[PDB]
Amino acid sequence: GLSDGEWQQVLNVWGKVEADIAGHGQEVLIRLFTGHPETLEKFDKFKHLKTEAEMKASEDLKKHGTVVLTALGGILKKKGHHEAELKPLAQSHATKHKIPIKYLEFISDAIIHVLHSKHPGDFGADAQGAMTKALELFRNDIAAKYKELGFQ
Ligand code: HEM
Numbered sequence: 477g478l479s480d481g482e483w484q485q486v487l488n489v490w491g492k493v494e495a496d497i498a499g500h501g502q503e504v505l506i507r508l509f510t511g512h513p514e515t516l517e518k519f520d521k522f523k524h525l526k527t528e529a530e531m532k533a534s535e536d537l538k539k540h541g542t543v544v545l546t547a548l549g550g551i552l553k554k555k556g557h558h559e560a561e562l563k564p565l566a567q568s569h570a571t572k573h574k575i576p577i578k579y580l581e582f583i584s585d586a587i588i589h590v591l592h593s594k595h596p597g598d599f600g601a602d603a604q605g606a607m608t609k610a611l612e613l614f615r616n617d618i619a620a621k622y623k624e625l626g627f628q
Pocket residue numbers: 515516518519520521543544545547548564565568569573575579580583
């Protein structure tokens with residue numbers, strides 16, 4: 477649960493992401509893949525990427541980064557009222573993609589990392605606190621659907 481002030485910060489920070497959704501999406505995925513190589517194995521269409529240079533050069537990775545952050549932004553803009561939006565994502569990630577919740581923790585931290593990297597000094601303490609809570613909420617609601625499905 478976030479306060480309205482906190483949601484306001486989240487959506488303020490998100491305005492930064494939306495000015496360049498593909499650049500942000502790209503850097504998030506790269507941070508995930510390089511920080512946690514086992515995650516790369518879950519993508520049949522990225523598993524070929526051996527080096528970070530190849531990742532940076534991949535237009536399809538940038539494309540998918542856009543898809544991911546477009547979906548996350550859709551969800552964030554609901555300010556917690558995201559059941560309809562989140563349920564299909566939980567179900568596809570549990571049943572088709574088979575993504576353990578640990579990896580959603582990974583990408584959550586990666587988003588925080590990227591925001592500091594692209595906006596040093598422009599991502600204050602309050603903003604980090606709000607974004608972190610929002611990603612925890614997102615993660616926690618997915619976690620509930622995972623439990624329901626018996627997925628580890
Ligand atoms: C903020 C977190 C995430 C969001 C918003 C998100 C969103 C999406 C969306 C919208 C799709 C396409 C529709 C679908 O298949 O349901 C997708 C596909 C996929 N996601 Fe996620 N995702 C997230 C995190 C992750 C993580 C952490 C992993 C793995 C470590 C992952 C693995 C995949 C894979 C393997 C696909 C299918 C890719 C393909 O073959 O086209 N996702 N994701």
